[PDB]
Every structure is written in C-alpha cells, then in structure tokens.
C-alpha cells in the first residue's frame, strides 16, 4: 500500500499491480510538424490532468455489465469538461483505475477492457425490421455510465467471449480488487471533436456472477478513478 497525488486529488491504492498499457504505446504528445502548426495546441498540465473519481456503481448478482464512452464521461465533468466543450480539437490518453471493495467472502470476476469506436447497436425493434438508432443516452451515457442489456453480444452483435482481444485486465475477487489500464490516443486522425466522437469506451462486465451467503453486504462498490495523459486541445470558442 501507498498513496499517490496529482494536484488536489489524493487516492489511496496498492503498491503497483500489473498495469496494462493498451497496444504497448504510451499516450504521448503530437509533435510540431502536424496539421495545425499555426494554432499551437495548448497541453493542459495544471489541474486538467488529475484524478477524477466517478459515482461508484454497485455490483449485484443480477448486474449485466457497464460501459462508459470516452471522452464523453468527462466532457460533462470538471475543468476538463470545460476544455472538451469550449475547444475545437482534442487528443488524449487515460490512466484508468477500477477498484472493488469486497471481503474475502464474496466471489466474482470482472473483465475490464477498452474498445475503440464502440458503436452501440440496439436490439432493432425485436423481429429485426425496425432501423432504430440508439438514443443519445445510450450513445453517450455521461459519467453515470450505462448497463448493457445484452452482455453476451455486447449490445453490438459481437461475442464478448472474444473481447479479450482488446486491452483488458481481470478482477477476480479472490486474487485482486484493483485493475489498471493506460490508453494511448487512438483514431484515424491526429485530432478530433471531443463531443461528436467517442474515440473509445470503457467496458466492465461481471463474467463470473457476484455471490455471497446471506448476511454479507449484497453490493460491491466499484470505484472508477481515471486521469488524462498527455492530453492536447486546439482552437478556443
């Protein structure tokens, strides 16, 4: 154990489990000879790159899974939700940290992964003959996230039994509680609208159902603390 601090944000965590650096690349910056060398893209250091600790979702036996969209989860929150809106372009990285606080008497397993361009396909009316486009609350669920309804196909017609092909890490309750991931900016472009485009999405599904005998706390507070890495903006409004 030992506590780390980035500004006014002080979280208490374990020494250093095994972190997952998505695709082996580190969220670096974008050099001078890029497409906008005129409007120098200011790189937020001060408070912009600090610890955001979201409304802890509660695990249950019946939980299906949860997902947040990026950078959507923060374009609402704090002084980064200040730059994400009143700025024209954006490129960022993310130190995501997911923790569970449960006793050695609860059991379960959470798969935690990041998926680029996570396009939510709805059910489509049922029989398949309705071309319904997911609402805006499902496409960009804010920092409250959203519950998958069809975890097996990840609400996008794809087997989750294969999601491990993305950066992921496991949260087996009998072995670990904390799970950490480092995401590098990923897109077909060097910069992009931080409001109209969610580069990726954080997925955390219960693969082995939460269980416990009667008496043990029925819910497991999953705390998601995350912070921007070598994030960049350009063109104030």
């Amino acid at each position: 154990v030992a506590q780390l601090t980035i500004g006014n944000s002080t979280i208490t965590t374990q020494e250093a489990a095994n972190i997952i650096v998505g695709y082996g690349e580190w969220p670096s910056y974008c050099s001078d000879s890029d497409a906008t060398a005129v409007d120098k893209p200011t790189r937020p250091d001060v408070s912009v790159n600090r610890f955001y600790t979201l409304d802890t979702k509660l695990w249950e036996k019946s939980s299906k899974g949860w997902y947040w969209k990026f950078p959507d989860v923060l374009t609402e929150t704090g002084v980064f939700g200040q730059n994400a809106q009143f700025h024209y372009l954006y490129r960022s990285g993310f130190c995501i940290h997911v923790q569970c606080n449960a006793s050695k008497f609860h059991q379960g397993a959470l798969l935690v992964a990041v998926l680029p361009e996570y396009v939510i396909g709805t059910v489509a009316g049922g029989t398949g003959t309705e071309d319904t486009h997911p609402p805006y609350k499902q496409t960009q669920p804010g920092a409250d996230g959203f519950e998958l309804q069809h975890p097996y196909v990840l609400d996008a017609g794809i087997p989750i039994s294969q999601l491990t092909v993305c950066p992921h890490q496991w949260i087996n309750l009998r072995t670990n509680n904390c799970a950490t991931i480092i995401v590098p900016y990923i897109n077909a472009l060097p910069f992009d609208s931080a409001l109209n485009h969610c580069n990726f999405g954080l997925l955390v599904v219960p693969i082995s159902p939460l269980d416990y005998d009667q008496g043990a706390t029925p819910v497991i507070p999953i705390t998601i603390t995350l912070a921007p890495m070598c994030s960049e903006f350009a063109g104030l409004r």
Binding site: K69, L115, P116, E117, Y118, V119, I120, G121, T122, V123, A124, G125, G126, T127, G128, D131, T132, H133, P134, P135, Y136, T139, H150, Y152, V153, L154, A156, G157, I158, P159, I160, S161, Q162, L163, V165, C166, I186, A188, L189, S193, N196, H197, C198, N199, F200, G201
Partner: protein, 218 residues
Amino acid sequence: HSTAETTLDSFFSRAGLVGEIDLPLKGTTNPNGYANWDIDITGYAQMRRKVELFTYMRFDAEFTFVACTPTGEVVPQLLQYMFVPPGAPKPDSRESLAWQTATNPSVFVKLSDPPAQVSVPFMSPASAYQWFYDGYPTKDLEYGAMPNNMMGTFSVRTVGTSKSKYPLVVRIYMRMKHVRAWIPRPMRNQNYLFKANPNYAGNSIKPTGASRTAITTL
C-alpha cells in the same frame, strides 16, 4: 514451417465479385441504358464480416470488368465505364454532361476486348478507412456514419446516342492490394440486419456456436 498464407495481404487479395449491373432492353430495371454504382466492398457477401474484424484499414483496389449478355454471350458493343471520384457529380441521365467531364476518368473498351482492368487508390481523406464510428458527423439518424470512406462511383453505359441493341450484364470484381490494418475486434456472431449499423435481432440472439446436452457428454 511457413506462415505466409495467414498474412493480411494474403487473407484479402483475390478478385471477388462485388457488383453486377443489368442493362436490359425491355425493363423496369435501369430503363435508360446506363447505371450508377457507388463503390461498396460489402457486395461480396463474405467480405462484410471479414473486414469488420478490424477498426481501421487501408488499401488500393484493382477492379476488373466482365461484360456480356444474360446467356453469357459476347457481342460487338462498345462501352464506357466512368469513374466519378467522390465529390464529383454522378450522371442523372443517359446524356448528362457528366459523361464528358475529363476529371471523371473513363475507359472505353469493346465487349470483345478482354476485361478492362484498373487500379483505384486509397481515396479517403482520413488516414484510414475506418469501419466503426462512435459519434455523429457535425437519438439521431446520423450515428455511426463515418463519411470519409467514399471510394467513388462507377457509371456504366453503352456508348452512343441511341439505346444499345442488346441486353447487357456488367460484373465488377475487385482485388484488394497493399492491405494494412489496425485495432482488431470481436468477430460478428450475430446476423447482420442493415448495411450501416451493428443493429442485431434482439429476439433471435443465438449462441456463438453449436450446443450440446451436458458439459460431460461429448
């Protein structure tokens, strides 16, 4: 000991049929002896699920054109295959000046002349054609619409002022060359419902694969 067959370029080459144009004499189908085919690589059934293994790709595509009559017969007819790059305007009529715009490459070949064949490049303005888009182009009917993936349009037509004398059928094959790909993702296990979205059939949600009776009986 060799593993070259499993490379991306290997996996993806081969000309596959992605399009077929009917130019009947008597018809409800393409009545003006001409046709417009915005280039879709999903035309080869198999293809949609294959490419959707990745999020970003890049490539050139060699197109070959096979034309004849329905009985698969050859005839003394000339043809104009025209390519209207994205941005350029498609011909609205069998005499639209779009047929004459020099900036719309056109290749003329007699049906007898073996298949015409041309290479088209990586059009996209983005650094890569990307299959998925988690946003909207600056509940909306524009979700998942990655625009900058337009390869162009192929306008086909019999040459000449008058209607062609024969019933014609053009087939467009396409070999994908120089393929590079990024960000891999879960193989589509659910049936496809529309060309644009991953929308699946929430009723008919099927297990990825075959099932059995007990986890002890093989």
